[PDB]
Amino acid sequence: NASTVATYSYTHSVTYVTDNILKSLKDIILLSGLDPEHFADRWESNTRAIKTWLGTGDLRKVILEIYNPATDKLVTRWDIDIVYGWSDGDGSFWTDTEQLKYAIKKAGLLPSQAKYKLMLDTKPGRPDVEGWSKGSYRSTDGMVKQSLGSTVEHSGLAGQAGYWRQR
């Protein structure tokens, strides 16, 4: 019953990064005061699509739009860009989301019926994933983007986070 330092496969690094990207978005929703039920019901569906396109390397961005349904316009948006720096499974792994909390406060109060929508930005030749079809981004005009640094990494596979707020 000995444990020793593990060498991890790429699929393991993908699984780790996928689970922690969704956890950070779950924390953004919790800290924003939004209903977590919608994101929770989609947890495995979102997981499958993110792992699929991280496995092929086609996934460019994970995007959470927070919008107002009365106006259909963005209130805030949260971006996580993928960095494909995976050379081997012997690299370090970590999560860091402490700065997301302060960005949510910077973004300010949200309207009473605010909702969220998850979007995945991919290369065009991406394999099809059941249930996932072409979407369109809500307009970011009149908003400002600020990068927040890397929120997750596992052995070179990393996610760089940023967000959009109204000026």
CA count, 13 A, side-chain hemisphere, 5: 5
Residue 139 is given by DSSP the state P
Give 52's contacts (C-beta < 8 A, 6+ positions apart).
127, 129
Residue with tokens 């950070």: 24
Give per-residue burial for 30-42: e unless 16+ CB within 10 Å, then b. Answer: eebebeeeebeee
Resolution in angstrom units: 2.1
**Count of CB atoms situated within 10 Å of the CB of 69:** 10
**Sheet hosting strand 59-68, strand order edge to edge:** 93-95, 143-154, 157-166, 73-84, 59-68, 115-122
Residue found under tokens 């496995």 = 55
What is the distance between the alpha carbons of residues 1 and 78, in angstroms, rounded to a whole number? 43
Distance CA 26, CA 43 (A): 10
Cα 136 to Cα 31, 119, 139, distances in angstroms: 26, 9, 9
